[PDB]
Amino acid sequence: MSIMKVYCQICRKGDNEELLLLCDGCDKGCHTYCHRPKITTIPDGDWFCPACIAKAS
Ligand SMILES: [Zn+2]
Ligand SMILES: [Zn+2]
């Protein structure tokens, strides 16, 4: 078996799940308020993290 729990890359906590953004690209997580600059809109759809966007460019 495999158990997967997502934790924020910055604070390493898995609380505040609505605000813990999960990347569709790489499956890593980060809270809106743990990003800098802080994210002040909750994405309505899927999320791609800044590392994945930089690489895709
Ligand atoms: Zn965090
Ligand atoms: Zn990513």
Side-chain angles (χ1 to χ4, degrees):
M1 78 196 67
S2 186
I3 292 151
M4 332 284 207
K5 185 151 156 68
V6 174
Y7 295 83
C8 175
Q9 294 282 104
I10 300 296
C11 68
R12 324 310 281 199
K13 311 181 94 155
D15 63 346
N16 269 134
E17 284 138 55
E18 173 158 291
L19 299 175
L20 177 61
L21 310 185
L22 316 173
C23 182
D24 256 85
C26 66
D27 306 314
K28 289 180 175 162
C30 191
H31 291 113
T32 50
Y33 53 76
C34 290
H35 284 271
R36 299 288 180 274
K38 291 176 172 183
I39 304 300
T40 58
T41 302
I42 300 165
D44 191 57
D46 296 311
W47 179 245
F48 290 96
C49 75
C52 287
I53 296 299
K55 280 191 200 62
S57 171

Short mmCIF file of all heavy atoms in Angstrom, two decimals:
data_model
loop_
_atom_site.label_atom_id
_atom_site.label_comp_id
_atom_site.label_asym_id
_atom_site.label_seq_id
_atom_site.Cartn_x
_atom_site.Cartn_y
_atom_site.Cartn_z
N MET A 1 0.83 -1.24 0.00
CA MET A 1 0.00 0.00 0.00
C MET A 1 0.84 1.25 0.00
O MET A 1 2.05 1.25 0.33
CB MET A 1 -0.86 0.12 1.26
CG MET A 1 -0.06 0.59 2.48
SD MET A 1 -0.82 0.34 4.12
CE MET A 1 -0.82 -1.46 4.27
N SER A 2 0.16 2.33 -0.34
CA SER A 2 0.72 3.67 -0.25
C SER A 2 -0.32 4.60 0.40
O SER A 2 -1.45 4.68 -0.09
CB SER A 2 1.02 4.17 -1.67
OG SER A 2 1.70 5.42 -1.63
N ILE A 3 0.07 5.32 1.45
CA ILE A 3 -0.74 6.41 1.98
C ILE A 3 -0.05 7.72 1.62
O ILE A 3 1.16 7.89 1.85
CB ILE A 3 -0.83 6.36 3.51
CG1 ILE A 3 -1.63 5.15 3.98
CG2 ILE A 3 -1.49 7.63 4.06
CD1 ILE A 3 -1.19 4.67 5.35
N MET A 4 -0.81 8.62 1.02
CA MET A 4 -0.30 9.93 0.58
C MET A 4 -1.06 10.99 1.39
O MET A 4 -2.29 11.06 1.31
CB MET A 4 -0.58 10.14 -0.91
CG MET A 4 -0.67 8.89 -1.78
SD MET A 4 0.93 8.14 -2.15
CE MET A 4 0.60 7.32 -3.71
N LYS A 5 -0.33 11.79 2.19
CA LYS A 5 -0.92 13.01 2.79
C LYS A 5 -0.11 14.21 2.30
O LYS A 5 1.12 14.15 2.25
CB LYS A 5 -1.00 13.00 4.32
CG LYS A 5 -1.74 14.23 4.89
CD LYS A 5 -2.42 13.93 6.22
CE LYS A 5 -2.64 15.16 7.08
NZ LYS A 5 -3.65 16.10 6.51
N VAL A 6 -0.84 15.24 1.87
CA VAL A 6 -0.22 16.43 1.33
C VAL A 6 0.03 17.43 2.41
O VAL A 6 -0.79 17.69 3.29
CB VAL A 6 -1.09 17.08 0.23
CG1 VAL A 6 -0.48 18.42 -0.22
CG2 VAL A 6 -1.16 16.12 -0.96
N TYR A 7 1.26 17.95 2.39
CA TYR A 7 1.65 18.98 3.34
C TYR A 7 2.11 20.19 2.51
O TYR A 7 2.60 20.04 1.39
CB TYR A 7 2.71 18.48 4.36
CG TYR A 7 2.29 17.35 5.35
CD1 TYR A 7 2.32 16.02 4.96
CD2 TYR A 7 1.91 17.63 6.66
CE1 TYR A 7 1.96 15.01 5.84
CE2 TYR A 7 1.52 16.63 7.52
CZ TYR A 7 1.55 15.33 7.10
OH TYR A 7 1.21 14.27 7.93
N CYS A 8 1.98 21.37 3.07
CA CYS A 8 2.46 22.59 2.38
C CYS A 8 4.00 22.59 2.28
O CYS A 8 4.71 22.30 3.26
CB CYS A 8 2.06 23.77 3.23
SG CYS A 8 2.69 25.37 2.65
N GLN A 9 4.55 22.88 1.09
CA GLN A 9 6.02 22.90 0.90
C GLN A 9 6.71 23.89 1.80
O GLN A 9 7.88 23.68 2.17
CB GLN A 9 6.33 23.27 -0.54
CG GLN A 9 5.90 22.25 -1.53
CD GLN A 9 6.87 21.08 -1.55
OE1 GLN A 9 6.58 20.00 -1.01
NE2 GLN A 9 8.04 21.30 -2.14
N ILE A 10 6.02 24.95 2.22
CA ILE A 10 6.66 26.00 3.04
C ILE A 10 6.49 25.77 4.55
O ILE A 10 7.50 25.72 5.28
CB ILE A 10 6.09 27.40 2.64
CG1 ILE A 10 6.37 27.69 1.15
CG2 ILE A 10 6.64 28.47 3.57
CD1 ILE A 10 7.83 27.80 0.78
N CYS A 11 5.28 25.61 5.05
CA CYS A 11 5.09 25.48 6.51
C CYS A 11 5.08 24.01 6.97
O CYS A 11 5.15 23.71 8.19
CB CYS A 11 3.80 26.16 6.95
SG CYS A 11 2.30 25.39 6.38
N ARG A 12 4.99 23.10 6.00
CA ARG A 12 4.98 21.62 6.21
C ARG A 12 3.79 21.12 7.01
O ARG A 12 3.82 20.01 7.60
CB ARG A 12 6.27 21.16 6.90
CG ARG A 12 7.49 21.93 6.47
CD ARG A 12 7.65 22.02 4.97
NE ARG A 12 8.18 20.77 4.60
CZ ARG A 12 8.81 20.46 3.49
NH1 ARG A 12 8.96 21.32 2.52
NH2 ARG A 12 9.30 19.23 3.36
N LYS A 13 2.74 21.91 7.06
CA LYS A 13 1.48 21.51 7.68
C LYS A 13 0.42 21.15 6.63
O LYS A 13 0.42 21.69 5.53
CB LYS A 13 0.97 22.58 8.62
CG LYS A 13 2.04 23.07 9.58
CD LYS A 13 1.52 24.14 10.54
CE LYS A 13 1.05 23.55 11.86
NZ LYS A 13 1.12 24.57 12.95
N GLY A 14 -0.52 20.29 7.00
CA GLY A 14 -1.61 19.87 6.09
C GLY A 14 -2.99 20.35 6.49
O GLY A 14 -4.02 19.83 6.02
N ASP A 15 -3.04 21.38 7.31
CA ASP A 15 -4.30 22.00 7.69
C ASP A 15 -4.85 22.96 6.62
O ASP A 15 -4.20 23.19 5.59
CB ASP A 15 -4.13 22.73 9.05
CG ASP A 15 -3.12 23.89 9.02
OD1 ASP A 15 -2.33 24.04 8.07
OD2 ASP A 15 -3.10 24.67 9.99
N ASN A 16 -6.00 23.58 6.89
CA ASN A 16 -6.55 24.59 6.00
C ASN A 16 -6.62 24.06 4.58
O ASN A 16 -6.13 24.70 3.63
CB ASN A 16 -5.73 25.88 6.01
CG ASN A 16 -6.20 26.88 7.04
OD1 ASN A 16 -5.39 27.46 7.78
ND2 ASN A 16 -7.50 27.12 7.09
N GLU A 17 -7.26 22.92 4.40
CA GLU A 17 -7.26 22.25 3.13
C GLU A 17 -7.82 23.06 1.97
O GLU A 17 -7.30 22.96 0.87
CB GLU A 17 -7.95 20.88 3.28
CG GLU A 17 -7.04 19.87 3.96
CD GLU A 17 -7.74 19.00 4.99
OE1 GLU A 17 -8.75 18.36 4.64
OE2 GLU A 17 -7.27 18.97 6.15
N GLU A 18 -8.83 23.90 2.21
CA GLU A 18 -9.41 24.73 1.15
C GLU A 18 -8.38 25.70 0.58
O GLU A 18 -8.43 26.10 -0.60
CB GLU A 18 -10.62 25.52 1.68
CG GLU A 18 -11.20 26.54 0.70
CD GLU A 18 -12.64 26.89 1.03
OE1 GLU A 18 -13.49 25.99 0.85
OE2 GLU A 18 -12.90 28.03 1.47
N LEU A 19 -7.41 26.07 1.42
CA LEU A 19 -6.38 27.04 1.07
C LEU A 19 -5.04 26.36 0.70
O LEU A 19 -4.09 27.05 0.30
CB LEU A 19 -6.15 28.02 2.22
CG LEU A 19 -7.40 28.85 2.61
CD1 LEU A 19 -7.07 29.70 3.83
CD2 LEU A 19 -7.94 29.70 1.46
N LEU A 20 -4.98 25.05 0.86
CA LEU A 20 -3.79 24.31 0.52
C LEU A 20 -3.89 23.90 -0.95
O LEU A 20 -4.54 22.90 -1.33
CB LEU A 20 -3.63 23.13 1.50
CG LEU A 20 -2.48 22.19 1.25
CD1 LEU A 20 -1.18 22.94 1.35
CD2 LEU A 20 -2.51 21.08 2.31
N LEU A 21 -3.27 24.71 -1.77
CA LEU A 21 -3.28 24.53 -3.24
C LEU A 21 -2.44 23.36 -3.74
O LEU A 21 -1.24 23.32 -3.44
CB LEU A 21 -2.86 25.83 -3.93
CG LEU A 21 -3.57 27.10 -3.48
CD1 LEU A 21 -3.07 28.19 -4.39
CD2 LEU A 21 -5.10 27.00 -3.47
N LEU A 22 -3.08 22.44 -4.45
CA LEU A 22 -2.42 21.22 -4.89
C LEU A 22 -2.20 21.35 -6.36
O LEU A 22 -3.16 21.58 -7.15
CB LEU A 22 -3.29 19.99 -4.60
CG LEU A 22 -3.94 19.96 -3.22
CD1 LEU A 22 -4.92 18.79 -3.06
CD2 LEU A 22 -2.86 19.93 -2.14
N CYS A 23 -0.95 21.18 -6.75
CA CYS A 23 -0.52 21.38 -8.13
C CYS A 23 -0.92 20.20 -9.00
O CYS A 23 -0.56 19.07 -8.68
CB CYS A 23 0.97 21.63 -8.28
SG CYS A 23 1.48 21.93 -10.01
N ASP A 24 -1.59 20.49 -10.11
CA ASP A 24 -2.03 19.41 -11.01
C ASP A 24 -0.85 18.83 -11.76
O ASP A 24 -0.91 17.69 -12.25
CB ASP A 24 -3.03 19.93 -12.03
CG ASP A 24 -4.42 19.53 -11.71
OD1 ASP A 24 -5.06 20.23 -10.91
OD2 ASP A 24 -4.85 18.48 -12.24
N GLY A 25 0.22 19.62 -11.88
CA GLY A 25 1.43 19.20 -12.57
C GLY A 25 2.27 18.22 -11.79
O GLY A 25 2.55 17.11 -12.27
N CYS A 26 2.69 18.64 -10.60
CA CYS A 26 3.65 17.91 -9.78
C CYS A 26 3.14 17.36 -8.46
O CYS A 26 3.91 16.72 -7.71
CB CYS A 26 4.84 18.82 -9.44
SG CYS A 26 4.42 20.23 -8.37
N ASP A 27 1.87 17.61 -8.16
CA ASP A 27 1.21 17.15 -6.93
C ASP A 27 1.79 17.70 -5.62
O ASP A 27 1.48 17.14 -4.56
CB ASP A 27 1.17 15.61 -6.87
CG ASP A 27 0.55 14.99 -8.11
OD1 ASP A 27 -0.52 15.47 -8.56
OD2 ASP A 27 1.13 14.01 -8.62
N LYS A 28 2.58 18.78 -5.68
CA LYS A 28 3.07 19.39 -4.45
C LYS A 28 2.02 20.42 -4.02
O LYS A 28 1.23 20.86 -4.83
CB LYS A 28 4.37 20.06 -4.68
CG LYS A 28 5.51 19.06 -4.92
CD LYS A 28 6.81 19.77 -5.14
CE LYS A 28 7.93 18.73 -5.24
NZ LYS A 28 9.16 19.28 -5.87
N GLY A 29 2.04 20.75 -2.74
CA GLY A 29 1.08 21.65 -2.09
C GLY A 29 1.70 22.89 -1.52
O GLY A 29 2.86 22.94 -1.14
N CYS A 30 0.91 23.98 -1.50
CA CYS A 30 1.34 25.17 -0.83
C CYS A 30 0.14 26.01 -0.47
O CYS A 30 -0.73 26.26 -1.32
CB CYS A 30 2.30 25.96 -1.71
SG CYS A 30 3.18 27.33 -0.91
N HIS A 31 0.08 26.49 0.76
CA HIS A 31 -1.05 27.37 1.14
C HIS A 31 -1.00 28.73 0.45
O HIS A 31 0.06 29.27 0.22
CB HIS A 31 -0.99 27.69 2.63
CG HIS A 31 -1.27 26.51 3.52
ND1 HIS A 31 -0.32 25.94 4.34
CD2 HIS A 31 -2.41 25.79 3.69
CE1 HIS A 31 -0.88 24.95 5.02
NE2 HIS A 31 -2.14 24.84 4.65
N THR A 32 -2.19 29.25 0.15
CA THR A 32 -2.28 30.57 -0.42
C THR A 32 -1.42 31.57 0.38
O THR A 32 -0.66 32.40 -0.18
CB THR A 32 -3.76 31.00 -0.37
OG1 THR A 32 -4.27 30.79 0.96
CG2 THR A 32 -4.62 30.31 -1.39
N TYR A 33 -1.49 31.51 1.72
CA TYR A 33 -0.87 32.49 2.60
C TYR A 33 0.58 32.20 2.92
O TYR A 33 1.24 32.99 3.59
CB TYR A 33 -1.69 32.58 3.91
CG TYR A 33 -1.93 31.24 4.59
CD1 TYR A 33 -0.92 30.59 5.31
CD2 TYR A 33 -3.14 30.61 4.50
CE1 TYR A 33 -1.14 29.39 5.93
CE2 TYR A 33 -3.39 29.41 5.14
CZ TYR A 33 -2.36 28.79 5.84
OH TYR A 33 -2.63 27.55 6.44
N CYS A 34 1.07 31.07 2.42
CA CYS A 34 2.48 30.67 2.53
C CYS A 34 3.27 31.02 1.28
O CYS A 34 4.49 31.15 1.36
CB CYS A 34 2.66 29.16 2.82
SG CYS A 34 2.13 28.73 4.49
N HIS A 35 2.60 31.24 0.13
CA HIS A 35 3.26 31.84 -1.00
C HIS A 35 3.70 33.26 -0.72
O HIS A 35 3.09 33.97 0.09
CB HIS A 35 2.32 31.96 -2.19
CG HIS A 35 2.08 30.69 -2.91
ND1 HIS A 35 2.89 30.26 -3.94
CD2 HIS A 35 1.12 29.75 -2.76
CE1 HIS A 35 2.42 29.12 -4.41
NE2 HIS A 35 1.35 28.80 -3.72
N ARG A 36 4.78 33.68 -1.39
CA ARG A 36 5.17 35.09 -1.47
C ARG A 36 5.38 35.42 -2.94
O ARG A 36 6.13 34.71 -3.60
CB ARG A 36 6.46 35.37 -0.71
CG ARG A 36 6.37 35.09 0.74
CD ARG A 36 5.51 36.14 1.44
NE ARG A 36 5.43 35.85 2.88
CZ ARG A 36 4.55 35.02 3.44
NH1 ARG A 36 3.62 34.39 2.73
NH2 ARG A 36 4.60 34.83 4.76
N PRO A 37 4.66 36.42 -3.47
CA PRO A 37 3.57 37.17 -2.85
C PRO A 37 2.42 36.25 -2.47
O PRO A 37 2.21 35.21 -3.09
CB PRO A 37 3.10 38.12 -3.97
CG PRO A 37 4.24 38.19 -4.93
CD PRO A 37 4.94 36.89 -4.84
N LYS A 38 1.69 36.62 -1.43
CA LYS A 38 0.59 35.79 -0.98
C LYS A 38 -0.49 35.79 -2.06
O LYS A 38 -0.69 36.80 -2.76
CB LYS A 38 -0.07 36.29 0.31
CG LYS A 38 0.79 36.16 1.55
CD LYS A 38 0.12 36.76 2.81
CE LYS A 38 0.92 36.44 4.06
NZ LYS A 38 0.18 36.98 5.27
N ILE A 39 -1.16 34.64 -2.18
CA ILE A 39 -2.23 34.45 -3.14
C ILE A 39 -3.49 34.87 -2.44
O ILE A 39 -3.84 34.33 -1.41
CB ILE A 39 -2.38 32.99 -3.59
CG1 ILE A 39 -1.07 32.44 -4.18
CG2 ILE A 39 -3.52 32.82 -4.57
CD1 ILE A 39 -0.59 33.20 -5.37
N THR A 40 -4.22 35.82 -3.03
CA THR A 40 -5.42 36.37 -2.40
C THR A 40 -6.71 36.03 -3.13
O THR A 40 -7.78 36.48 -2.70
CB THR A 40 -5.31 37.90 -2.21
OG1 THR A 40 -5.10 38.52 -3.47
CG2 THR A 40 -4.18 38.27 -1.27
N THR A 41 -6.61 35.19 -4.16
CA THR A 41 -7.77 34.58 -4.83
C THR A 41 -7.67 33.06 -4.73
O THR A 41 -6.65 32.48 -5.15
CB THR A 41 -7.82 34.92 -6.35
OG1 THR A 41 -7.86 36.34 -6.54
CG2 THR A 41 -9.03 34.29 -7.02
N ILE A 42 -8.70 32.39 -4.23
CA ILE A 42 -8.73 30.93 -4.27
C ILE A 42 -9.09 30.51 -5.70
O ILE A 42 -10.14 30.93 -6.25
CB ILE A 42 -9.71 30.34 -3.25
CG1 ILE A 42 -9.31 30.76 -1.81
CG2 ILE A 42 -9.74 28.82 -3.32
CD1 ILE A 42 -10.39 30.53 -0.77
N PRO A 43 -8.21 29.71 -6.33
CA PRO A 43 -8.46 29.29 -7.67
C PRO A 43 -9.79 28.55 -7.81
O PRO A 43 -10.11 27.66 -6.99
CB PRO A 43 -7.28 28.35 -7.98
CG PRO A 43 -6.16 28.80 -7.10
CD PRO A 43 -6.85 29.29 -5.85
N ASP A 44 -10.55 28.96 -8.82
CA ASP A 44 -11.86 28.35 -9.06
C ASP A 44 -11.80 26.98 -9.70
O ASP A 44 -12.76 26.17 -9.60
CB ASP A 44 -12.62 29.33 -9.98
CG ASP A 44 -14.05 29.02 -10.12
OD1 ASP A 44 -14.76 28.96 -9.09
OD2 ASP A 44 -14.48 28.90 -11.31
N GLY A 45 -10.68 26.71 -10.37
CA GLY A 45 -10.44 25.44 -11.05
C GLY A 45 -9.20 24.73 -10.59
O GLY A 45 -8.96 24.58 -9.40
N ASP A 46 -8.37 24.33 -11.55
CA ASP A 46 -7.12 23.62 -11.21
C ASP A 46 -6.04 24.61 -10.91
O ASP A 46 -6.13 25.79 -11.28
CB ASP A 46 -6.70 22.81 -12.38
CG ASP A 46 -7.72 21.73 -12.69
OD1 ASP A 46 -8.13 20.97 -11.75
OD2 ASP A 46 -8.03 21.67 -13.88
N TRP A 47 -5.04 24.12 -10.20
CA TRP A 47 -3.85 24.92 -9.86
C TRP A 47 -2.57 24.33 -10.48
O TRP A 47 -2.43 23.13 -10.50
CB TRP A 47 -3.73 24.95 -8.35
CG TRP A 47 -2.56 25.71 -7.87
CD1 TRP A 47 -1.50 25.20 -7.19
CD2 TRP A 47 -2.31 27.10 -8.04
NE1 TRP A 47 -0.61 26.19 -6.92
CE2 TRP A 47 -1.07 27.37 -7.43
CE3 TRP A 47 -2.99 28.13 -8.66
CZ2 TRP A 47 -0.52 28.63 -7.39
CZ3 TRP A 47 -2.45 29.41 -8.59
CH2 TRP A 47 -1.19 29.63 -8.01
N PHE A 48 -1.72 25.20 -11.04
CA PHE A 48 -0.36 24.84 -11.43
C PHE A 48 0.58 25.77 -10.71
O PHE A 48 0.39 27.03 -10.75
CB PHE A 48 -0.22 24.96 -12.96
CG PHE A 48 -1.00 23.90 -13.70
CD1 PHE A 48 -2.29 24.17 -14.17
CD2 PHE A 48 -0.46 22.64 -13.85
CE1 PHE A 48 -3.02 23.17 -14.80
CE2 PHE A 48 -1.20 21.63 -14.48
CZ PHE A 48 -2.47 21.92 -14.95
N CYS A 49 1.56 25.17 -10.05
CA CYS A 49 2.42 25.90 -9.12
C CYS A 49 3.44 26.71 -9.91
O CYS A 49 3.68 26.53 -11.10
CB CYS A 49 3.13 24.99 -8.13
SG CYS A 49 4.50 24.07 -8.86
N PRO A 50 4.09 27.68 -9.23
CA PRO A 50 4.96 28.54 -9.99
C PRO A 50 6.16 27.81 -10.62
O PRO A 50 6.67 28.22 -11.64
CB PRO A 50 5.41 29.56 -8.91
CG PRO A 50 4.34 29.57 -7.90
CD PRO A 50 3.85 28.15 -7.86
N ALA A 51 6.61 26.74 -9.97
CA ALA A 51 7.76 25.98 -10.52
C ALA A 51 7.34 25.32 -11.83
O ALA A 51 8.07 25.35 -12.81
CB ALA A 51 8.25 24.94 -9.53
N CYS A 52 6.13 24.75 -11.84
CA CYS A 52 5.64 24.12 -13.07
C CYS A 52 5.37 25.10 -14.18
O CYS A 52 5.73 24.84 -15.30
CB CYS A 52 4.40 23.28 -12.79
SG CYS A 52 4.71 21.73 -11.90
N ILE A 53 4.85 26.27 -13.87
CA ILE A 53 4.65 27.31 -14.87
C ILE A 53 5.97 27.81 -15.46
O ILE A 53 6.12 27.92 -16.67
CB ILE A 53 3.81 28.45 -14.24
CG1 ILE A 53 2.40 27.96 -13.86
CG2 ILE A 53 3.69 29.61 -15.20
CD1 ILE A 53 1.54 27.47 -15.03
N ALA A 54 6.94 28.12 -14.60
CA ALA A 54 8.29 28.48 -15.08
C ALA A 54 8.95 27.49 -16.04
O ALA A 54 9.58 27.89 -17.04
CB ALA A 54 9.20 28.71 -13.88
N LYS A 55 8.79 26.20 -15.76
CA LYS A 55 9.33 25.15 -16.61
C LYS A 55 8.59 25.03 -17.92
O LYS A 55 9.21 24.78 -18.93
CB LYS A 55 9.22 23.81 -15.94
CG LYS A 55 10.28 23.48 -14.91
CD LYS A 55 10.18 22.00 -14.55
CE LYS A 55 10.84 21.69 -13.22
NZ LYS A 55 10.19 22.40 -12.09
N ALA A 56 7.26 25.18 -17.89
CA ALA A 56 6.44 25.05 -19.12
C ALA A 56 6.71 26.15 -20.13
O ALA A 56 6.69 25.91 -21.34
CB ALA A 56 4.96 25.03 -18.76
N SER A 57 6.98 27.36 -19.64
CA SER A 57 7.17 28.54 -20.47
C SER A 57 8.08 28.31 -21.69
O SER A 57 7.78 28.79 -22.79
CB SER A 57 7.76 29.67 -19.64
OG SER A 57 8.14 30.73 -20.51
ZN ZN B 1 1.75 26.49 4.49
ZN ZN B 2 3.80 22.00 -9.76
#
